[PDB]
């Protein structure tokens, strides 16, 4: 079995800029989300080889993870906060599509998402 290449975290072809909202999202990742135990399955791309889930990248064609998101934020990859929020929602949706409701991984994703939603409710107005 083989993993796909991980999502890009730099792209000289893709427009980008620094904004106060994206700095907010970076510190949300670094200072609020990452530190919880429930984050550990989401801190890196799914290793379908190690997990013995050969179906994973058959089912999930838009993989995303918080390790990728953190790097994108650190690297100023995004043009706006909507792009970053979309990446979080892709990560959560993948988990909910792939796993049975009630599975521990779904509960972990829901804990992470609850915290995430609390923070994006307080997203600062863009400067
Ligand atoms: O230096 C430039 C343009 Cl000035 N080239 C470039 C620019 C962007 C690029 N993007 N590559 C990827 C690779 C993977 C994904 S992903 O798996 O969908 O996340 C996205 C973009 C690849 C390349 S390149 O193939 O390495 O030339
Ligand atoms: O990217 C920018 C650059 Cl100005 N802005 C942005 C980007 C995303 C955004 N999304 N906010 C939310 C708020 C709540 C949910 S909800 O709880 O899942 O309904 C989703 C997105 C709000 C905004 S904003 O309201 O325009 O600041
Ligand atoms: O097509 C699906 C998802 Cl793959 N239907 C589904 C939907 C929900 C489900 N069971 N969910 C739960 C969730 C929580 C508990 S609990 O921890 O005992 O409260 C039990 C079942 C099982 C299934 S099912 O096992 O696949 O029929
Ligand atoms: O995000 C999701 C799944 Cl994608 N929420 C969800 C949605 C429905 C759900 N259903 N749980 C149950 C629990 C018990 C029964 S019963 O004992 O068979 O009546 C059915 C569904 C469990 C959950 S979950 O346990 O929080 O995953
Ligand atoms: O570290 C990587 C490689 Cl870039 N990926 C990864 C990604 C997720 C993961 N664990 N995922 C799950 C899935 C389901 C459950 S369960 O529902 O509680 O059984 C737990 C962890 C394990 C791993 S792994 O152990 O490191 O292979």
From Swiss-Prot:
Positions bearing the site annotation: Acetylated histone binding: 99
Result of altering residue 104 to G: Found in a patient with a neurodevelopmental syndrome; uncertain significance
Superkingdom assignment: Eukaryota
Subcellular location: Nucleus; Chromosome
Reported modifications of this chain: Phosphorylation by CK2 disrupt the intramolecular binding between the bromo domain 2 and the NPS region and promotes binding between the NPS and the BID regions, leading to activate the protein and promote binding to acetylated histones. In absence of phosphorylation, BRD4 does not localize to p53/TP53 target gene promoters, phosphorylation promoting recruitment to p53/TP53 target promoters.
Crosslink (Glycyl lysine isopeptide (Lys-Gly) (interchain with G-Cter in SUMO2)) position: 58
Residue intervals of the Bromo domain: 17-123
Tissue expression profile of the protein: Ubiquitously expressed.
Entry's disease: Cornelia de Lange syndrome 6: A form of Cornelia de Lange syndrome, a clinically heterogeneous developmental disorder associated with malformations affecting multiple systems. It is characterized by facial dysmorphisms, abnormal hands and feet, growth delay, cognitive retardation, hirsutism, gastroesophageal dysfunction and cardiac, ophthalmologic and genitourinary anomalies. CDLS6 inheritance is autosomal dominant.
Functional description taken from the UniProt entry: Chromatin reader protein that recognizes and binds acetylated histones and plays a key role in transmission of epigenetic memory across cell divisions and transcription regulation. Remains associated with acetylated chromatin throughout the entire cell cycle and provides epigenetic memory for postmitotic G1 gene transcription by preserving acetylated chromatin status and maintaining high-order chromatin structure. During interphase, plays a key role in regulating the transcription of signal-inducible genes by associating with the P-TEFb complex and recruiting it to promoters.
Comment field on protein domains: The NET domain mediates interaction with a number of chromatin proteins involved in transcription regulation (NSD3, JMJD6, CHD4, GLTSCR1 and ATAD5). The C-terminal (CTD) region mediates interaction and recruitment of CDK9 and CCNT1 subunits of the P-TEFb complex. It is also required for maintenance of higher-order chromatin structure.
Further comment: JQ1, a thieno-triazolo-1,4-diazepine derivative, and I-BET, a benzodiazepine derivative, have been tested on tumors with success. Treatment with GSK1210151A (I-BET151, a I-BET derivative) has strong effets on mixed lineage leukemia and promotes myeloid differentiation and leukemia stem-cell depletion.
Family: Belongs to the BET family.
Complex and partners: Interacts with p53/TP53; the interaction is direct. Interacts (via CTD region) with CDK9 and CCNT1, acting as an associated component of P-TEFb complex. Interacts with RELA (when acetylated at 'Lys-310'). Interacts (via NET domain) with NSD3, CHD4, BICRA and ATAD5. The interaction with BICRA bridges BRD4 to the GBAF complex. Interacts (via NET domain) with JMJD6 (via JmjC and N-terminal domains); the interaction is stronger in presence of ssRNA and recruits JMJD6 on distal enhancers. Interacts with NSD3. Interacts with NIPBL. (Microbial infection) Interacts with bovine papillomavirus type 1 regulatory protein E2. This interactions may serve for the tethering of viral genomes to host mitotic chromosomes allowing successful partitioning of the viral genome during cell division.
Name of the protein: Bromodomain-containing protein 4
Native source organism of the sequence: Homo sapiens
Gene: BRD4
Portion held of the full protein: 44 to 168 of 1362
């Amino acid at each position: 079995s083989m993993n796909p290449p991980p999502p890009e975290t730099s792209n000289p072809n893709k427009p980008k800029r620094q904004t106060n909202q994206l700095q907010y999202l970076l510190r949300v990742v670094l200072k609020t989300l990452w530190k919880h135990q429930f984050a550990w399955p989401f801190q890196q791309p799914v290793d379908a080889v190690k997990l013995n889930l050969p179906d994973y990248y058959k089912i999930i064609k838009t993989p995303m993870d918080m390790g990728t998101i953190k790097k994108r934020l650190e690297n100023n990859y995004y043009w706006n906060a909507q792009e970053c929020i979309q990446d979080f929602n892709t990560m959560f949706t993948n988990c909910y599509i792939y796993n049975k409701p009630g599975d521990d991984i779904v509960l972990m994703a829901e804990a992470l998402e609850k915290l995430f939603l609390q923070k994006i409710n307080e997203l600062p107005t863009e400067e």
